[PDB]
Amino acid sequence: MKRTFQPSVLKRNRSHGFRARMATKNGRQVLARRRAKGRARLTVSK
Amino acid sequence: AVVKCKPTSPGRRHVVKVVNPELHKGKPFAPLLEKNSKSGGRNNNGRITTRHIGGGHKQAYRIVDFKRNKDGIPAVVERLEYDPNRSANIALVLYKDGERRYILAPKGLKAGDQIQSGVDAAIKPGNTLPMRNIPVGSTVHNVEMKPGKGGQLARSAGTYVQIVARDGAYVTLRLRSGEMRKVEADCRATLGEVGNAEHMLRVLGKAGAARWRGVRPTVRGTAMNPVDHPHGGGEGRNFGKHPVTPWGVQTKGKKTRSNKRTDKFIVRRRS
Amino acid sequence: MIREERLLKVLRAPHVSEKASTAMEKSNTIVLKVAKDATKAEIKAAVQKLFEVEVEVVNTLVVKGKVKRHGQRIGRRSDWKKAYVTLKEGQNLD
RNA sequence: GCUCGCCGGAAGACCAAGGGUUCCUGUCCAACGUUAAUCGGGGCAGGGUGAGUCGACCCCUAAGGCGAGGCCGAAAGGCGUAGUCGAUGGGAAACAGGUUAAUAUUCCUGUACUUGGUGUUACUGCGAAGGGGGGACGGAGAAGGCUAUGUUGGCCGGGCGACGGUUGUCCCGGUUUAAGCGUGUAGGCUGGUUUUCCAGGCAAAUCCGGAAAAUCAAGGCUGAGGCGUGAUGACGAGGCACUACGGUGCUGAAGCAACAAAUGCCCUGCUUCCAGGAAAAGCCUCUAAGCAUCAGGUAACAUCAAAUCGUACCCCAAACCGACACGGUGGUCAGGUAGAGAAUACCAAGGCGCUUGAGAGAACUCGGGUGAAGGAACUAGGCAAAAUGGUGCCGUAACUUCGGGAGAAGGCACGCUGAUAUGUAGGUGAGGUCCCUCGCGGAUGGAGCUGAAAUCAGUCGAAGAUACCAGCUGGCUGCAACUGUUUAUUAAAAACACAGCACUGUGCAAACACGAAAGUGGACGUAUACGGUGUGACGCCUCCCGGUGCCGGAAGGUUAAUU
RNA sequence: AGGACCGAACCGACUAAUGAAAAAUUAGCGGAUGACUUGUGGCUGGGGGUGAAAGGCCAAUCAAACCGGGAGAUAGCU
């Protein structure tokens, strides 16, 4: 059965990657939030 | 000519083809071509703005000349061509100076016919001259509404317009709709009717044919649930309401012209 | 033209392994560890100057670092650049 | 190690994606492995991924994204021009053999190619953000020419049979060879060459386009395959020396022909249809500003250059997505016998026996086999089973929209051997002989090879479409015309859609829709068009305006802000 | 020629019996040149999308997704 997650690196990066997050305001805020929390992996970026 | 196809299969039974042998069997004039990608009836927001559009065959865009400005040069018709972009047929013409253009093929036009634009041009089919030069009572097509803009009225397969009157700076046209309309007398127009008049006699004959023409199927509002359409819901088949659009506006009669800027040019509305 | 200092900083070490020994003995090819940033021409220049020996050609590759586990803690070894340097016929290297 | 069994259009081989060391070697067996474990995709250590020509990067663009100015917007921001990104598409170049425990079109051996510089001598119009050409394009169908590949014969090597026979019309194996370079064929497309002029190609153009005029019928482009060379080479069945029993080193015959033949190539071709079928660069070409005897261009020759990143391994799976060593997952390769076949059966190459076993041979459950007599009596219901099942030929009703119905129904033949005919009809096609504008040519010729289908005669069986495979059929009737779609995971239908019909709106800055707007779709469309609503092939058809809607009217009544 | 026929791949999911499986199995079943199917990338966003329309689908979630916040909502109820 085709399960929901069907990985694709490029698609992952474009969707969720660092630059994408940077591009828009809301993404930047998300980034800031994650930094505040102390996340080790700020983004999906490997 | 129209051709009723033999019923060797359902979906072929009711088919009627409109076959013109005189069209060009060959690849169109490539210089005048250009790309034309499909919308899916969706705008820049990405939302569907006009339902029932989608798919269909890849099509190129022939660059038709509706402005028709090569004044004084006589042109000769090379061939008639299938345009997927319109109900009419187009004609590839060759001006004496070596330029080629696509034009709406009028009714009587065929290969070898000579045509001409200009004030001086001769009043014969396919020739184009300002409507102050065109005699009253003539049939014309590809009519400009604004001078210099390009023909906008009467471009569809078997349309034409009647010049009923010329009163000073304006002439009054009889549009195919039956609407009588004033138009500036200096606007341009092409003599005769537009060509492919038996276009209406074709019948698709199956669902797939409609799809080929980029038309997605139509769901009736009454078949929906109320949350979707004003007509939705009802146990079994119920329709206890006045007909309306998906957006609640009355459909069977309610007029919707709101343009107060051009009211003056409409002599008489259609009926 | 490569600067001497850069040349000196290129070459990290000789690589000892069975495959390396075989390459040395048969094909007259030395296997070096080099700076990850070091390009082929650079490596060649450095070979020529610092080992005083003619080079035919350099093949390079990047070795990825192994993931290991010290006790309970996971940790990755460094990636590093390997270079097969083929030396001109009759070139004997100390 | 020897037997047995399974897959073999896969359960084999190679990739992409995704994973990220799982690869190889040594070592260990606590935990992990549904048992044991000396084994492991487990632990620990070490090793392993070599590129000018493969891919990325790079040049070009699609859908789309971002977007200087700009337009719009309380703010945030939205749209969008110039631009710039964006492959899943276009754009230069490599093949064969050998080698590692583990990489290889990357190492080695041989033989190649590419496109840049730089320098040269030789020549002499070069030059783009611009013009033109090209790239550049659909579906289906039909062949013909080919090859991949396979079969047989020939040849070469080996063999003479654990049991009757087996020196022959016997048995086993092998019989392979690239890119490149030369040739330019089967075939496809197109008339060429020169001269003159011209409101066209945002300017110019010697280019394209268009007009004339002259002259010759061959000119050019394209093109699989074959042939030659590449190759006195490599590889080569197996023989022979050493042996850490893993292998290593030497050596090495023949290496031809015919037939058959793709879904691969010629073919981005041809024929045809309507639903009318990317873009841009690379590439060719034309000039402009320019420069002017310099640069630049093309000409060979020399030299330098090709960086960087990926390259292990799995990849229909125990390594990816599924919590698991648990169904899903795109591409490429496609042997033999039978067969229409990529179905099916048995096999090859190759890969596996699915990580608990041993007994026993109760009930009951699951999955199968057979069954006297009856044959739907079962049951809500013939559910399920059983049955039918192929090719050829004969034959086939109502009704019909004249196409259908129809494989209607129902029947007959079917194996093997011999003869017709020491293998026919056909297909292919060598020598020889003749012609020739000479070649991959044309005629004639028929050797050899291959080879159905039929008829007649015989013959065995209970049975010859013998296994696997492979329609059940007919009669009346509701609904829906039909092919389609649908509740992912209890509903596939009479529901939706449909072609068709009708009403209605909409004159283009269209109606309408998304948008505080700008704008966008509608549509690069224009009433033979587009939108909305209902009905729903086809046939015969299809009173009430009082109510509520809509349309038109505006005499009077009433009536806002305002005053 | 064909939204033509029989039929593998491929797409589906009518009947049947039966956790390896949070929808599968085997045996049969429908389509199989098209209103087909499929890879890669792109766009549409929550009273919003998309919808051959079933209130279907929008990450095992849908008559209004998920995450965080108002928030210790309110609970004459248990």
**CATH of residue A15:** 1.10.287.3980
Q: Two tokens at C74?
A: 């996971």
Q: Which single residue is written with the structure tokens 């010049």?
A: B163
CA atoms of B165 and B178, how far apart (whole Å) = 15
CA atoms of C36 and B44, how far apart (whole Å) = 48
- DSSP string computed for B44-78: TTSSB-STTB-------EE-B-SS---BS-EEEEE
Burial of B132 (0-12, 13-18, 19+ CB in 10 A): middle
Domain that holds residue C57: 2-94
Listed as own residue / partner, the contacts of B208-211 with beta carbons closer than 8 Å and 24 or more positions apart are B208/B11, B209/B15, B211/B55, B211/B56
Residue B117 phi/psi, 5° resolution? Answer: -105, 155
Task: Examine the domain organization and report whether B129 and B219 are in the same domain.
Answer: no
Q: How many structural domains does chain C have?
A: 1
Task: Examine the domain organization and report whether B242 and B179 are in the same domain.
Answer: no
The three-class DSSP label of residue C4 is helix
CA atoms of A9 and A18, how far apart (whole Å) = 13
Half-sphere exposure (CA, 13 Å, Cβ side) for B52? 7
Task: Examine the domain organization and report whether B109 and B122 are in the same domain.
Answer: no
Residue A2 (CA) to nucleotide D364 (C1'), in angstroms, measures 39
CA atoms of B221 and B228, how far apart (whole Å) = 8
Nucleotide with minimal C1' distance from the CA of B211 is E35
For residue B216, the domain's CATH number is 4.10.950.10
CA atoms of A35 and C65, how far apart (whole Å) = 28
Element spanning C11, H or E: strand C11-14
Query: How many C-beta atoms surround the C-beta of residue B146 within 10 A?
Result: 11
Burial of C52 (0-12, 13-18, 19+ CB in 10 A): exposed
Query: By C-alpha distance, which of B98, B108, B109 is closest to B75?
Result: B98
* Helix, strand and coil in chain A, % to nearest 5: 60, 0, 40
Query: By C-alpha distance, which of B115, B181, B116, B177 is closest to B146?
Result: B181
Task: Examine the domain organization and report whether B2 and B108 are in the same domain.
Answer: yes
Query: By C-alpha distance, which of C50, C40, C39 is closest to C13?
Result: C50
CA atoms of B182 and B205, how far apart (whole Å) = 40
The three-class DSSP label of residue C92 is coil
Domain that holds residue A36: 1-46
CA atoms of B231 and B241, how far apart (whole Å) = 7
Query: How many C-beta atoms surround the C-beta of residue B199 within 10 A?
Result: 17
Query: By C-alpha distance, which of B190, B204, B82 is closest to B141?
Result: B190
Neighbours of chain A (3+ CB pairs under 8 A): none
CA atoms of C80 and C32, how far apart (whole Å) = 11
- Report the phi/psi class of residue B224: left, alpha or beta, with left for phi > 0 and alpha for psi in -120 to 50: beta
Nucleotide with minimal C1' distance from the CA of B73 is D199
CA atoms of B63 and B69, how far apart (whole Å) = 15
Please say which residue of B113, B129, B159 terminates a domain: B113
CA atoms of C60 and C37, how far apart (whole Å) = 11
Residues with Cβ within 8 Å of B167's Cβ and at least 6 positions away in sequence, in order, are none
Please say which residue of B162, B194, B226 terminates a domain: B194
Q: How many structural domains does chain B have?
A: 3
Say if residues B80 and B111 touch (Cβ distance below 8 Å): yes
Task: Examine the domain organization and report whether B248 and B154 are in the same domain.
Answer: no
Q: Two tokens at B130?
A: 């300002």
Question: CA–CA distance from B66 to each of B79, B130, B177, B202 (Å)?
Answer: 18, 14, 21, 26
CA atoms of B19 and B198, how far apart (whole Å) = 10
Say if residues B217 and B52 touch (Cβ distance below 8 Å): yes
Residues with Cβ within 8 Å of B98's Cβ and at least 6 positions away in sequence, in order, are none
Question: CA–CA distance from A3 to each of A11, A12, A13 (Å)?
Answer: 17, 17, 20
Task: Examine the domain organization and report whether B99 and B127 are in the same domain.
Answer: no
Q: For strand D, which residues in window 7-46 of chain A come within 7 Å by CB?
A: 7-10, 23, 25
Domain that holds residue B98: 1-113
The reply to whether B267 Cβ lies less than 7 angstroms from strand D is no
The reply to whether B114 Cβ lies less than 7 angstroms from strand D is no
**Beta-strand relationship, B16-18 and B33-34:** unpaired
Residue B131 phi/psi, 5° resolution? Answer: -70, -10
Task: Examine the domain organization and report whether B26 and B101 are in the same domain.
Answer: yes
Residue A1 (CA) to nucleotide D363 (C1'), in angstroms, measures 40
CA atoms of B78 and B23, how far apart (whole Å) = 11
Q: Two tokens at B36?
A: 């034309």
CA atoms of B23 and A27, how far apart (whole Å) = 57
Strand partners, C86: C29, C57
CA atoms of A9 and A44, how far apart (whole Å) = 10
Neighbours of chain B (3+ CB pairs under 8 A): none
Burial letters C13-35, b for 16+ CB under 10 A, else e: eebeeeebeebbeeebbbbbebb
Tell me the technique behind this structure.
cryo-EM
Residues with Cβ within 8 Å of B262's Cβ and at least 6 positions away in sequence, in order, are none
Q: How many structural domains does chain A have?
A: 1
Look up residue C52 and give its amino acid.
E
Task: Examine the domain organization and report whether B88 and B15 are in the same domain.
Answer: yes
Q: Two tokens at B197?
A: 């008049």
Residue B265 phi/psi, 5° resolution? Answer: -75, -20
Q: Which nucleotides of E are covered by protein (CB under 7 A)?
A: 1-4, 21, 23-24, 34-36, 40-45, 49-55, 59-60, 63-64
For residue C38, the domain's CATH number is 3.30.70.330
The 8-class DSSP code of residue B265 comes to G
Query: How many C-beta atoms surround the C-beta of residue B211 within 10 A?
Result: 16
